[PDB]
RNA sequence: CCGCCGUUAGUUGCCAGCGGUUCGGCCGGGCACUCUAACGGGACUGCCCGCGAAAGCGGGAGGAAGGAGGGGACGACGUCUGGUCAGCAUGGCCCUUACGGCCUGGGCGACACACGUGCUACAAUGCCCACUACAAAGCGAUGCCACCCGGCAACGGGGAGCUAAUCGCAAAAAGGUGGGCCCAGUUCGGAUUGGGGUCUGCAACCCGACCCCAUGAAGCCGGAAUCGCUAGUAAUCGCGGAUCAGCCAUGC
């Protein structure tokens, strides 16, 4: 009845609620196709739905927040993947080498005090 | 189909083609084109002499352009160089007015940089 | 001349636009973090030599 | 009906005290809404290491300021009494308000 | 450029108010090359300071009312 | 580099047709960050291109890719002083890679208005062999067999 | 620091489930969830297929995480007798009815030029308008400065809150929705030049930043060379902060 799911990615945390039903999603206040009318990673975030073809089995209400829209979206992906696992661990087993429960190592990392953008030094003169 | 100083833009959005012109930018443009009619969108190949004429009736019958704006500035400058205020001093000597940085820059008001001789670089290495 | 500069803005002279800070344990106003009134090098000597609560060699 | 604000430095020392609050207050007073933590506010600063004026050689330092918060219901005698007589910060500071 | 009311110098004020009341000399020296130009002096030879020495200049008409030191050169060598 | 033979690394499995070629192209067009601006340009493109002809996009696309696939290159070689131009048969990775990036070059030249038409025109012309980058590819092949001498003197 | 799990606590928040509901958590109500955080855990090539005298290399399972997890702080014995006494301390040497005190004024802002390092464009992967999303990080009751009245605004008048997860600085921007430009110095671009002003400050001459009426320069992507950089990195995108009255801050 209450298939809760968590999903974190890049300065954003997705409070993903999955309930049983239609496999249709209304995210944070706007429709899935309307909130996310810009990045096609939207439907890509629904990859777990398409992974078990459950884009019709289980409804969803979402509360993802933080970062930028993209990171939010991918985080939602992790969330959807994690909601079914809690209530059906037969599903995590078939979804591991698919890369669904392995995470990142990213942020716009701490600024350097010798270079502009960490990798960007002052250009070098020599003379 | 003319106005002043033999100026005709020909086939374009009116007010833009007008902003192309000396002494008047977008502000004055919209101002005139909103006090004396004419919608901005209309291209000029479909005009009529009436509003052309009365537009030119807001143009010169009010402020000043071309022949004056240059002459006025010129007079003011003749004043800046009448007692020789620091400003007019630097008007003569060939530099900007701000008095900021001319040590390496200042080539927007006095031609290309003609290298003296470098004055010979020491061992900076 | 160095003795004057410190006694100068010490006893309040005229307009607010002439109030330079001071590392009172060295004597300078330049890059003096006006939260303490301590210059760069000297804020560093005091902090280094441990005489400061809650001052941390950042590890973040 | 009691609110208390806590501003301390050293985490270990402060927390054991912030524990000593809610713990012993759960005795001398009734229910003590445990130390709902307030983000370690930090006064950030930067400096150099060498005096021979360069544009290199720099280190970052943080004034790490710990915040802790306490809420209490309807108070008692004993609370006031014993929890006004003792406190050993030897550092940390405590500032309270009964809104 | 001061919102309302302009900025000048009242030492020159005390000097000039009794200078106008007569129209005495041609010696209106000023070791204060700051104050904005104020026409209320009938324009006499402001023998102002030049950072280095007391260099003069006459004030006449067209100068509507603009600051002082820009007329005391103070900068040596020209280019 | 030295101790290392480096490694490979995955390409974003196209979220429309599920191929690596697609995203490699996408990433070429992807400028200054916004992957989806330029990607949108190429998908708009693919829709236009698949309107113009009677076959699917990956077909025309792959045919163009084959019209590239630069099988031989020319590097630099020491000879105690003089310079050699070593004509060597590539690893298909760089073949297809700079096939997509030189595709992108041909698109850089193309004087078309909106980008979609540039990319489109390019894929057509290329798929036939009338493409700029394809032409280029065979020209660099001419470079490869012009120094056929150097094909026996490599580094 | 950040990535997962857990114990530990909810005036941040939350209908996740109910209610009031001005269908804004706005309010009872809860604190499961978010976060915030005290403390721990958790992954070692432990294991599996294989090869190797080994080191260990290739695949696989497992799992939040792999086989240094993405980064730090740390910079040896000693060198370059580099350099800082003008940040300091300090020896030595020198000034003393002054190389010092006071101050007004100007000067480090000056200029025929070489160069570094930074910024902003030469457009159509791009600019202008409206429209509307999604960041973190911080400073702020000797301060941060909103909400209304004004105005083109800078900025000022009434001044509201905030000793501050509860109020504020504050508005992110790229984007993307609808339209307009049309490859032309091009509504590209903003230096320079004139005049109108407001703030700050005693006061913006030599010496300020900004709102505005006017020009709209040089430039249609760059010689010889030289430069950074292996991924959330180049690039792009905005900001807080700090010294600081304001302010040349594109710097850091």
Curated annotation (Swiss-Prot), chain B:
Region (Disordered): 94-125
Record-level GO cellular component terms: cytosol; small ribosomal subunit
GO molecular-function terms, A-Z: rRNA binding; structural constituent of ribosome; tRNA binding
Organism domain of life: Bacteria
Gene3D superfamilies: 1.10.8.50, 30s ribosomal protein s13, domain 2 (4.10.910.10)
Gene Ontology BP annotations: translation
The UniProt record lists the keyword Ribonucleoprotein: yes
Protein keywords: Ribonucleoprotein, Ribosomal protein, RNA-binding, rRNA-binding, tRNA-binding
NCBIfam families reported in the protein's UniProt record: uS13_bact
Family: Belongs to the universal ribosomal protein uS13 family.
Subunit and partners: Part of the 30S ribosomal subunit. Forms a loose heterodimer with protein S19. Forms two bridges to the 50S subunit in the 70S ribosome.
Function text: Located at the top of the head of the 30S subunit, it contacts several helices of the 16S rRNA. In the 70S ribosome it contacts the 23S rRNA (bridge B1a) and protein L5 of the 50S subunit (bridge B1b), connecting the 2 subunits; these bridges are implicated in subunit movement. Contacts the tRNAs in the A and P-sites.
Full protein name: Small ribosomal subunit protein uS13
Organism name: Thermus thermophilus (strain ATCC BAA-163 / DSM 7039 / HB27)
Gene that produces this protein: rpsM
Swiss-Prot record, chain C:
Molecular function in Gene Ontology: rRNA binding; structural constituent of ribosome; zinc ion binding
Cofactor detail note: Binds 1 zinc ion per subunit.
Domain of life where this protein originates: Bacteria
PROSITE patterns listed in its UniProt record: RIBOSOMAL_S14
Entry's Gene Ontology cellular component terms: cytoplasm; small ribosomal subunit
Gene3D superfamilies associated with the record: 30s Ribosomal Protein S14, Chain N
Pfam family, one: Ribosomal_S14
Gene Ontology terms describing biological process: translation
Binding-site residues, Zn(2+): 23, 26, 39, 42
Ribosomal protein keyword on record: yes
SUPFAM superfamilies documented for this protein: Glucocorticoid receptor-like (DNA-binding domain)
InterPro entries reported in the protein's UniProt record: Ribosomal_uS14 (IPR001209), Ribosomal_uS14_bact (IPR023053), Ribosomal_uS14_CS (IPR018271), Ribosomal_uS14_sf (IPR043140)
Cofactor(s) it depends on: Zn(2+)
Keywords noted in UniProt: Metal-binding, Ribonucleoprotein, Ribosomal protein, RNA-binding, rRNA-binding, Zinc
HAMAP family in UniProt: Ribosomal_uS14_2_B
Record function comment: Binds 16S rRNA, required for the assembly of 30S particles and may also be responsible for determining the conformation of the 16S rRNA at the A site.
Family per similarity comment: Belongs to the universal ribosomal protein uS14 family. Zinc-binding uS14 subfamily.
Assembly notes: Part of the 30S ribosomal subunit. Contacts proteins S3 and S10.
Identification of the protein by name: Small ribosomal subunit protein uS14
Curated annotation (Swiss-Prot), chain D:
Keyword NADP found: no
InterPro entries for the chain: Ribosomal_uS10, Ribosomal_uS10_CS, Ribosomal_uS10_dom, Ribosomal_uS10_dom_sf
GO biological process, one term: translation
A molecular-function term among this protein's GO annotations: structural constituent of ribosome
Coiled-coil portions: none
Keywords of this entry: Ribonucleoprotein, Ribosomal protein
One term under GO cellular component: ribonucleoprotein complex
Gene3D superfamilies per UniProt: Ribosomal protein S10 domain (3.30.70.600)
Matches recorded under Pfam families: Ribosomal_S10
Assembly and binders: Part of the 30S ribosomal subunit.
Protein purpose: Involved in the binding of tRNA to the ribosomes.
Family note: Belongs to the universal ribosomal protein uS10 family.
Protein name listed in UniProt: Small ribosomal subunit protein uS10
Lineage: Bacteria, Thermotogati, Deinococcota, Deinococci, Thermales
Gene: rpsJ
From Swiss-Prot, chain F:
Molecular-function GO term, any one: rRNA binding
Entry keywords, A to Z: Ribonucleoprotein, Ribosomal protein, RNA-binding, rRNA-binding, tRNA-binding
Record Pfam families: Ribosomal_S7
InterPro entries attached to this UniProt entry: Ribosomal_uS7, Ribosomal_uS7_bac/org-type, Ribosomal_uS7_CS, Ribosomal_uS7_dom, Ribosomal_uS7_dom_sf
GO biological process, one term: translation
Zinc-finger in keyword set: no
Keyword Cytoplasm carried by entry: no
GO cellular component: small ribosomal subunit
Protein function: One of the primary rRNA binding proteins, it binds directly to 16S rRNA where it nucleates assembly of the head domain of the 30S subunit. Is located at the subunit interface close to the decoding center, probably blocks exit of the E-site tRNA.
Subunit structure: Part of the 30S ribosomal subunit. Contacts proteins S9 and S11.
UniProt family annotation: Belongs to the universal ribosomal protein uS7 family.
Protein name: Small ribosomal subunit protein uS7
Species annotation: Thermus thermophilus (strain ATCC BAA-163 / DSM 7039 / HB27)
């Amino acid at each position: 009845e209450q298939y809760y799911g968590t999903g974190r990615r890049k300065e954003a945390v997705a409070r993903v609620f999955l309930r049983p039903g239609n496999g249709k999603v209304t995210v944070n206040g706007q429709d899935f196709n309307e909130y996310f009318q810009g990045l096609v990673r939207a439907v890509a975030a629904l990859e777990p739905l398409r992974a078990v073809d459950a884009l019709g089995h289980f409804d969803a209400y979402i509360t993802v927040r933080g970062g930028g829209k993209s990171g939010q979206i991918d985080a939602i992906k992790l969330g959807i993947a994690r909601a079914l696992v809690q209530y059906n661990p037969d599903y995590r087993a078939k979804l591991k080498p698919l890369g669904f429960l392995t995470r990142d190592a990213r942020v716009v990392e701490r600024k350097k005090y010798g270079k502009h953008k960490a990798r960007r030094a002052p250009q070098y003169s020599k003379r | 189909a003319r106005i002043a100083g033999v100026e005709i833009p020909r086939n374009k959005r009116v007010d833009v083609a007008l902003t192309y012109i000396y002494g008047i930018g977008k502000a004055r443009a919209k101002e005139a084109l909103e006090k004396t009619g004419i919608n901005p969108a209309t291209r000029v190949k479909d005009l009529t002499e009436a509003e052309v004429v009365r537009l030119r009736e807001y143009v010169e019958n009010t402020w000043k352009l071309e022949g004056e704006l240059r002459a006025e500035v010129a007079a003011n400058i003749k004043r800046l160089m009448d007692i020789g205020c620091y400003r007019g001093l630097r008007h003569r000597r060939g530099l900007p007015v701000r008095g900021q940085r001319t040590r390496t820059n200042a080539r927007t008001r006095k031609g290309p940089r003609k290298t003296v001789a470098g004055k010979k670089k020491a061992p900076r290495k | 001349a160095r003795k004057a500069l410190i006694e100068k803005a010490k006893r309040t002279p005229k307009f607010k636009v002439r109030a330079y800070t001071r590392c009172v344990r060295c004597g300078r106003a330049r890059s003096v973090y006006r939260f303490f009134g301590l210059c760069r090098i000297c804020l560093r000597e005091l902090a280094h030599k441990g005489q400061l609560p809650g001052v941390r060699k950042a590890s973040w | 009906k009691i609110r208390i604000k806590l501003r301390g430095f050293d985490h270990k020392t402060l927390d054991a005290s912030a524990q000593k609050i809610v713990e012993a207050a759960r005795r001398s007073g009734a229910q003590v809404s445990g130390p709902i933590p307030l983000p370690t506010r930090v006064r950030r600063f930067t400096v150099i290491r060498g005096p021979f004026k360069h544009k290199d050689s720099r280190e970052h330092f943080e004034l790490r300021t710990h915040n802790r918060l306490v809420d209490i219901i309807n108070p008692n005698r004993k609370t006031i009494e014993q929890l006004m007589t003792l406190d050993l910060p030897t550092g940390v500071e405590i500032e309270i308000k009964t809104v | 450029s001061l919102k309302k009311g302009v900025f000048v110098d009242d030492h020159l004020l005390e000097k000039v108010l009794e200078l106008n009341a007569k129209g005495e000399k041609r010696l209106i020296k000023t070791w204060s090359r700051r104050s904005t130009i104020v026409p209320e002096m009938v324009g006499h030879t402001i023998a102002v300071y030049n950072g280095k020495q007391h260099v003069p200049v006459y004030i006449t008409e067209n100068m509507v009312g603009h600051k002082l030191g820009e007329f005391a050169p103070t900068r040596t060598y020209r280019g | 580099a030295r101790r290392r033979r480096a490694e490979v690394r995955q390409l974003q499995p196209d979220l429309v047709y599920g191929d690596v070629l697609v995203t490699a192209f996408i990433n070429k067009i992807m400028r200054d960050g916004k992957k989806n601006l330029a990607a949108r340009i190429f998908y708009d493109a693919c829709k236009i291109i698949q309107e113009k002809t009677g076959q699917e996009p990956l077909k025309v696309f792959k045919q163009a890719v084959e019209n590239v696939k630069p099988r031989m290159e020319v590097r630099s070689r020491r000879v105690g002083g003089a310079n050699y131009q070593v004509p060597m048969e590539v690893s298909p990775r760089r073949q297809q890679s700079l096939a997509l990036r030189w595709l992108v070059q041909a698109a850089n030249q193309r004087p078309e208005r909106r980008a979609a038409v540039r990319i489109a025109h390019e894929l057509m012309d290329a798929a036939e062999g009338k493409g700029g980058a394809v032409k280029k590819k065979e020209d660099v092949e001419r470079m490869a067999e012009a120094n056929r001498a150097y094909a026996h003197y490599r580094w």
